[PDB]
Amino acid sequence: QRPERIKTTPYLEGDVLSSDSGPLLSVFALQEIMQKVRQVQADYMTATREVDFTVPDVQKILDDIKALAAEQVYKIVKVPSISFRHIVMQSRDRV
Amino acid sequence: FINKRIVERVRVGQILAVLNRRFVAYKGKMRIMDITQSLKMGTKLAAPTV
Amino acid sequence: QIILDLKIDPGERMDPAVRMVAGVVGHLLFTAGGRFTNLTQNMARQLDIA
């Protein structure tokens, strides 16, 4: 289906060592940034408003941005709001 | 006799009159770290012996 | 967007020949060209001493 991956000569055929993917490197890349900062702050004195570098679940976020694409701003009614009312006084010709 | 202005009797308008020294305060969000102990990290390269 | 460095640690003890052959590999695997760079200004120095 792709003529860039047709093995006609046995030169590009070897063992299969490991396998990565999209959502296995993105959670991995956020771990190796926060671990480099939590290390060099725990080795020497610092002076910082304390923040805690955690790694959120990226797969829930991309499953939640798409969930905002299903929401509807408008609504569909059969009658508008009442928008006006009246107060009957003790008279019978003036409200 | 001591020629050092240790105690004056001042009016209440002169309480804030000693504000004349310039301080420099670093930001709260930025950080300040001491890397004096970081001038010794490093491995000695072993010479190749057979 | 992502650069590389060297991670000097004393917790391991490797062969003195695995460093020199890893300098020949880095001089033809990475790119420190005139437009972008894969490896930093310090690791480009340490692959030369290797």
From TrEMBL, chain B:
Q: Note the superkingdom of the native organism.
A: Viruses
Q: What is this protein called?
A: VP3
Q: Which gene encodes it?
A: VP3
Record's subcellular location: Virion
